Amino acid sequence: GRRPARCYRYCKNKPYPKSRFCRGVPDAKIRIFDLGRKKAKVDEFPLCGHMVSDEYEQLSSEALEAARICANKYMVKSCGKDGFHIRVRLHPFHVIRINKMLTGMRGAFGKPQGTVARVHIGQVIMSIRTKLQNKEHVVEALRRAKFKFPGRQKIHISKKWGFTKFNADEFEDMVAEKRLIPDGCGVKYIPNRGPLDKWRALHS
Amino acid sequence: ENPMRELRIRKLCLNICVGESGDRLTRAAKVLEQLTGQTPVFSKARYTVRSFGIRRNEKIAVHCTVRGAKAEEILEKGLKVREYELRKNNFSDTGNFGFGIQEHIDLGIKYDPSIGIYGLDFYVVLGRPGFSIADKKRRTGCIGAKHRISKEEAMRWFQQKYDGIILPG
Amino acid sequence: FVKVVKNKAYFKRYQVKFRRRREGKTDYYARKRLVIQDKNKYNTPKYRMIVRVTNRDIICQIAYARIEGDMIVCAAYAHELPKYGVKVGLTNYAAAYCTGLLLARRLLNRFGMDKIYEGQVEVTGDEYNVESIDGQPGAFTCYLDAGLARTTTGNKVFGALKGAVDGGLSIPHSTKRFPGYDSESKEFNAEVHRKHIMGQNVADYMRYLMEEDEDAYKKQFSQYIKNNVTPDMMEEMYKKAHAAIRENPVYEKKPKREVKKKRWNRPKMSLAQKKDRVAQKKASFLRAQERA
Amino acid sequence: TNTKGKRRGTRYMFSRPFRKHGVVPLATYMRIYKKGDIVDIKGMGTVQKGMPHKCYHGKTGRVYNVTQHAVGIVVNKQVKGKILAKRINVRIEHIKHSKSRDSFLKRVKENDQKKKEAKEKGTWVQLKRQPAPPREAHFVRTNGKEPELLEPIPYEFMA
RNA sequence: GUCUACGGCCAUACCACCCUGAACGCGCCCGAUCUCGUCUGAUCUCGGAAGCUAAGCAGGGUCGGGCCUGGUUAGUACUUGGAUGGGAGACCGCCUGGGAAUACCGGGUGCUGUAGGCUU
RNA sequence: GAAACCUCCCGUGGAGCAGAAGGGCAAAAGCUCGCUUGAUCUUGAUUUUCAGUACGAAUACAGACCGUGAAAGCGGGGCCU
RNA sequence: UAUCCGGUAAAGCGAAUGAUUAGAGGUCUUGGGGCCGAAACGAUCUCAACCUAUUCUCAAACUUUAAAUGGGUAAGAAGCC
Ligand SMILES: [Mg+2]
Ligand SMILES: [Mg+2]
Ligand SMILES: [Mg+2]
Ligand SMILES: [Mg+2]
Ligand SMILES: [Mg+2]
Ligand SMILES: [Mg+2]
Ligand SMILES: [Mg+2]
Ligand SMILES: [Mg+2]
Ligand SMILES: [Mg+2]
Ligand SMILES: [Mg+2]
Ligand SMILES: [Mg+2]
């Protein structure tokens, strides 16, 4: 049906998003960019395993989805149906083209074949949060998920708390301070600045 | 002991939307002219609506803005036919109120088989001293804040002045 | 509830209009046409006879525009007029005339063209304008800056403009909006105009009220009744004032001194005060809640 | 092949900057150009009468003519192999005084000061400029405290 | 100290709500005979001066938003010139000079020209 | 009645400006009135394509005769391409 | 050495435009489907769009920012007084 992944790998063209101009684009294979217990509280999942990319390459929507199932399947089988949260952090926005041959190279300009993610060197592909129990189960999940992607991707466990931007060493104190306040999957960082009436809702 | 926070009637607005044009509208314009003691204005439609049977720039409604003592007098008549009751929803958050009358002859006008029974629409722009700031030409402004009439404040003016009830629901 | 119209975003993207455009003062559309010179004129001034009527006052200024902030060569106010003769009705058309006239005379006295360009003396009211005399310094010429005033027939600005024209400034104008000119005929009386210049429109209203009801007259013309300005006294009064202006227009100010130098205002609260003030509100909240 | 249209590609060039739209504030108009004023051209979107062509934006040149509300201005425009000094009639709004020349005039004025004085004295003074010379010999006192050692830091992978 | 008229630069000047304003101003304010204009003396025009700072206006306030300006981000991202450097490629490292932008954290919150007041 | 007409509030333009898109534009360049024919007559200069020839299109002036506005001004077609 | 010009790399999207993930919060709206309701903004979920802070990820024909390399001028007798 579709072309080999070989042929759309390197980030060669300018980014060609689905827009006014580029239309009639077929929908991306991947759709659900996160799954597992996504309705979980910051506190009850701090681990944050990442699959980072080490190639400035393009990943297919097809390969993302496949990798996502692969990781989630293992996470379910391993720990449990509601024991993790996985986030895919690359959406296929770039539209990829296809000049098709039954005229020759005259007036050759592609129709939209499919979509694709462009991924920089050092950029995270997938990311998983679960417990301090469960580190090894994530690693292998991401390990298995590597095999669905072309190029090369390290698996890495971050020094953050969960899917927060905050360093896990200081996360718990900050809550004690109320620097930080739980807010679904995330956590709202409160600063000094805002009128004092906001400060009177806390400390009360 | 307030000096000029004296909530007054800035203007009274009266409109008969017949939604016809031609003769019905010319007929209804006489009713306001008998009531207010001044020629009204015909407003035209914004755009055609095949449902209502109106066309763009076709004269739909007649209306007029009464000011001063005559607006106080006509407002009084309009409340007498309504029996000095309003509701909470009849007041706008801006501190204005309004109410219908179902037939102008109730106010105190003679019917005619031609010049029939045009129901009409009172609406009262309440105001204060020094609201004109907004609408003058040169050094304009906005009327502060503790000076703006609240919904509550306009209800209590009605509850005092015209001895009204403001029934709930 | 609704979508907040005035977000962070709104204010980030927001552009203010100029300061005086905000204050509701300066029509910059008109200012550009008024004030800028033709570049090949170079640094030669472009004067304008600014006239603004305040609720209690009429100011008449002559100004050109430099880049630092348009400079004012001369001015006359309606509140000066007491010197000359005018006790009351200082925002009235007649007063506007005196105030304009006075500006012309005071201006002319600076340049030494007080003796040349006497201008119109008898006050006809008709189309008058100044012809510059050959072998003599030319006639001063500015243009009327009406401002935001709705320029209609009989507007008081044109009362001032008429005055400065009779005072001997060549300011171009038509008579299409002096009070007198008829809309549904298109001729100019210039006796109606004279009446207005002399305050006879005011005197007749005074005579009309006194005839009808004493109390309304007494209410309407309270400062006219005090100072004893009567209807029959009115025309003479303005003619005296015109002469006195015409004989001595020079402004002398008052020698202002003996000032205590005290702050009526409230000065700006220093960082450190503001910093503590929240500190005290923080403490006071804590000590307050540790009770109930 | 691209369109020859006058305004092609001036989407950004002739576009008032961020939060500087609206009234062309008045100094702009009311400042005087004589003959032989050095003047830098910079087209503007609000005023479309007397706009310069996109080629002369950025370019500086001298004023030759001054009309009522514009200024003729000789500017040099390169064309493949030949520089053509050519004369264009820009409306004031698209033009500033180029300061480039004033720093020169400041220096010549300063020279005339330093030539009048130092003549009766006898001591001749350096009027020519000189490029930044090598930075001279000097001591550095490590006052009490010794130097601070800088080990390069061990790598770690952050993302 | 501060205002009015005409301003220049146009948020350090905007917005929100809160407080305070002596004198002079500026206003709101009271009228429609005349000028002028409205469906309407609301606006506009005109004649006033009994009230009042309620509002506009000014000055201040807010762990305020916004804007302005520093730090950090970071010698990071990018990048001129160099090599028979690496790497299967993708890309990367070095040399040679140049060098940013958010988030985050500080500080600031109109200056001033001409003419004329008031605080004598 | 989700939509008719009226009224108060907010509203940096998120509308509109014949048409493609881009720019520009708020006591306007938008809308609504009033008066109009500068879309008129006539020299050269200049810009843009450029060979630095033409055409078209435009820019600044200058001389006439008008328009409009209290005026300063603006206007010799269409906000600019 | 002075001085203008710039909107590409980068960056940004808790700034506009457009795209786009997630949960917190919200009878804003209202609905369509429910379950417990005669029915009830009653209770309970829900999914629609909208909104209040956050959050994931983007742009040749988006952008508040904004490089490097780069293009003008100027650096005197044709000047000063
Ligand atoms: Mg094959
Ligand atoms: Mg390609
Ligand atoms: Mg005007
Ligand atoms: Mg009135
Ligand atoms: Mg006040
Ligand atoms: Mg107050
Ligand atoms: Mg702040
Ligand atoms: Mg047009
Ligand atoms: Mg001509
Ligand atoms: Mg470009
Ligand atoms: Mg980019």
XYZ file of N, CA, C and O (backbone and C1' of nucleotides) and ligand atoms in Angstrom, chain E residues 29-32 41-47, ligand 4:
78
model
P -24.456 67.607 34.351
O -24.655 68.853 35.326
C -25.112 68.685 36.681
C -25.289 70.031 37.346
C -26.383 70.896 36.752
O -27.612 70.466 37.323
C -24.433 72.207 37.055
P -28.936 70.400 36.441
O -29.401 71.920 36.403
C -29.679 72.656 37.606
C -29.989 74.086 37.250
C -30.917 74.253 36.060
O -32.263 74.081 36.477
C -29.080 75.749 35.885
P -33.395 73.806 35.392
O -33.388 75.148 34.538
C -33.585 75.124 33.121
C -33.526 76.530 32.587
C -33.807 76.673 31.099
O -35.213 76.809 30.880
C -31.741 77.695 31.606
P -35.963 75.957 29.735
O -35.677 76.802 28.414
C -35.871 78.230 28.400
C -35.234 78.839 27.176
C -35.840 78.402 25.843
O -36.093 79.516 24.986
C -33.504 77.966 25.863
P -36.099 69.191 23.436
O -34.680 69.426 24.123
C -33.486 68.818 23.593
C -32.245 69.463 24.167
C -32.292 69.821 25.651
O -31.019 69.641 26.272
C -31.813 71.745 24.399
P -30.878 68.867 27.680
O -30.181 67.497 27.266
C -29.824 66.559 28.288
C -29.018 65.415 27.725
C -27.886 65.774 26.767
O -26.711 66.078 27.516
C -29.230 64.099 25.794
P -25.841 67.385 27.179
O -25.257 67.057 25.736
C -24.375 65.939 25.561
C -24.144 65.660 24.100
C -23.672 66.831 23.256
O -22.268 67.020 23.379
C -25.400 65.683 22.125
P -21.675 68.487 23.565
O -22.165 69.242 22.252
C -21.634 68.868 20.972
C -22.302 69.627 19.847
C -22.489 71.125 20.028
O -21.273 71.796 19.718
C -24.494 70.184 19.226
P -20.710 72.947 20.676
O -21.661 74.180 20.348
C -21.867 74.604 18.988
C -22.954 75.651 18.889
C -23.036 76.680 20.004
O -22.093 77.710 19.761
C -25.185 75.840 19.599
P -21.509 78.537 20.978
O -22.791 79.291 21.535
C -23.307 80.442 20.855
C -24.604 80.858 21.492
C -24.489 81.387 22.911
O -24.223 82.782 22.891
C -26.244 79.797 22.770
P -23.769 83.532 24.222
O -25.064 83.433 25.145
C -26.008 84.513 25.248
C -26.727 84.451 26.573
C -25.822 84.482 27.790
O -25.536 85.827 28.131
C -27.430 82.750 28.022
Mg -29.143 71.238 29.322
